[PDB]
């Protein structure tokens, strides 16, 4: 049915199942530009996902959610069909088009699944205007107590931990973390901050700015240099893109590496991840859920003879930029969330019920 994202890249063997899409072969080349079969706000969101414009995890969440906000508020029902079914329907191909233009993390998975459970949990009696309005209000309460309250709560809770003088490690664009760090520094506690970042999507500069423009003495260096700062940093402070079944954590291509080395030099491991992130599947391995992004956005600048521009053009070549890795609970010490400062291997229970 839908125009199909054209698989790009000599897909490596051990990662064939998950696809290597890209951002040059735009998905909107084929679609009937009249946004009838495909809602206009949802499709504008889908596009500015493909272009990788929105990155932040809960940021991508709020984005999708306000997009479906618009959809609902301008949605109308077919003649004589109960809303709590054809709405679920209409959402389905939109979710599919999303997964096409940009794979969907467990965050937006939990989001859309909750929204479906809400849609269906109200029956025929829904008057169109009042139905759409109640959905607006429920989406509101959702975003409120899941991403603009959970944040402040996590911070107001973790603040008690950060002592004086103890420089702290962070990994990148984890907006939540930056909020914690600021709302901490503004309370008298003092500390430096080291930031760590990785190719290709050099990013910590997001957090680097959002820190220094709040007046915290900072420091920043690529991830393979981790071992040079680990004998000094006293508490790591990661981000997280999901909490899985066993109790692990998932995050960007790095975070497992830093978890490992920082376990090695005996510096306690923090993680900060708000409830609704918490998915329910498990991943002991690190290779069966990873949203491979483009190859040819990998390379860097050497003189001008960028060593890979002829990417497919060889025979054997097979690139990859894995996006998510998973720290097993064997390393992560403390996962701060609004529910408490729970320990890692005890997450799935207290977040299941």
């Amino acid at each position: 049915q839908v125009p199909t994202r054209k698989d790009y890249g000599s897909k490596v063997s051990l990662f064939s199942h998950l696809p290597q899409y890209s951002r040059q072969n735009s998905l909107t080349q084929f679609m009937s530009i009249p946004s009838s079969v495909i809602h206009p706000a949802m499709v504008r969101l889908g596009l500015q996902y493909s272009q990788g414009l929105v990155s932040g995890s809960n940021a991508r969440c709020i984005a999708l959610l306000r997009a479906l906000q618009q959809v609902i508020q301008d949605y109308t029902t077919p003649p004589n069909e109960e809303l709590s079914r054809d709405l679920v329907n209409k959402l389905k191909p939109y979710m599919s088009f999303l997964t096409q233009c940009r794979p969907l993390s467990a965050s937006m998975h939990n989001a859309i699944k909750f929204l479906n459970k809400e849609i269906t949990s109200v029956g025929s009696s829904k008057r169109e205007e009042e139905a759409k309005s109640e959905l607006r209000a429920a989406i509101d309460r959702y975003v409120q107590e899941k991403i603009v309250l959970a944040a402040q709560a996590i911070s107001r809770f973790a603040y008690q931990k950060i002592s004086n003088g103890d420089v702290i490690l962070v990994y990148g664009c984890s907006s939540l973390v930056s909020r914690i760090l600021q709302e901490a520094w503004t309370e008298g506690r003092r500390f430096r901050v080291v930031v760590v970042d990785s190719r290709p999507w050099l990013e910590g500069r997001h957090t680097l700015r959002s820190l220094v423009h709040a007046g915290v003495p900072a420091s920043y260096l690529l991830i393979p240099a981790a071992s040079y700062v680990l004998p000094e940093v006293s508490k790591v402070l990661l981000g997280a893109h999901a909490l899985l079944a066993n109790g692990s954590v998932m995050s960007r291509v790095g975070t497992a590496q830093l978890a490992l080395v920082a376990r090695a030099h005996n510096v306690p491991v923090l993680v900060c991840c708000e409830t609704y992130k918490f998915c329910e599947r498990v991943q002991t391995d690190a290779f069966v859920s990873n949203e491979l992004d483009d190859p040819d956005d990998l390379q860097c600048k050497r003189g001008e003879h960028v060593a890979l521009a002829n990417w497919q053009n060889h025979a054997s070549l097979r690139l990859l930029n894995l996006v998510y890795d998973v720290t097993p609970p064997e390393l992560v010490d403390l996962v701060i969330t609004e529910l408490g400062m729970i320990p890692c291997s005890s997450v799935p229970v207290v977040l299941r019920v």
């Binding site: 409120q144 107590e145 309250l149 959970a150 402040q152 709560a153 809770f157 409830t275 609004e338 207290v350």
Partner: protein, 176 residues
């Protein structure tokens, strides 16, 4: 801005209070309908289920009406209850809250127009005037109630305080 001629409310008074800070034995509830009356509230049974509940920091400030089971003045608290209430009394407390807000904006515009830099003296003048205007109707702080009832055509009852025509001016203006 004090509360009323009842600076220390008596029993069965269902104050419209917010939850200043979630606590252990019970959420410390604070209100301004008694000039910042602060006490506890007996944590309910399914509120003993507030362990796995979400964000005890969220839902801190979202005020609601609660009855005052116990009372104290020197001990300085109030035990408000919520589970055993009715929404009709909630609408009545909403009316009393609209009256409270009206009187608060009134005292603010007094402090501005009548330049009453003093707090206790101006607030006592206002409270005495409100009790005068009220005890004939005996509703909860019926001063401003009668003020807006007669202010359609006769708010001249301000003659007793011929101290600032800006008072009745701002009243009859911000009203309509």
């Amino acid at each position: 801005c004090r509360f009323y001629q009842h600076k220390f409310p008596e029993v069965e008074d269902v104050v419209m209070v917010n939850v200043r800070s979630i606590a252990e034995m019970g959420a410390y509830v604070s209100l301004l309908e008694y000039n910042n009356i602060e006490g506890m509230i007996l944590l309910s049974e399914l509120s003993r289920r507030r362990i796995r509940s979400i964000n005890k920091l969220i839902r801190i400030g979202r005020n609601e009406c609660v009855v005052v089971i116990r009372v104290d003045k020197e001990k300085g608290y109030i035990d408000l209850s919520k589970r055993r209430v009715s929404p009709e009394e909630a609408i009545k407390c909403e009316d009393k809250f609209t009256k409270s807000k009206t009187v608060y904006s009134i005292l603010r515009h007094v402090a501005e127009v009548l330049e009453y830099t003093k707090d206790e003296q101006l607030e006592s003048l206002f409270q005495r005037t409100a009790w005068v205007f009220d005890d004939k109707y005996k509703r909860p702080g019926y001063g401003a109630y009668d003020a807006f009832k007669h202010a359609v055509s006769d708010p001249s009852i301000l003659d007793s305080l011929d101290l600032n025509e800006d008072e009745r001016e701002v009243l009859i203006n911000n009203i309509n």
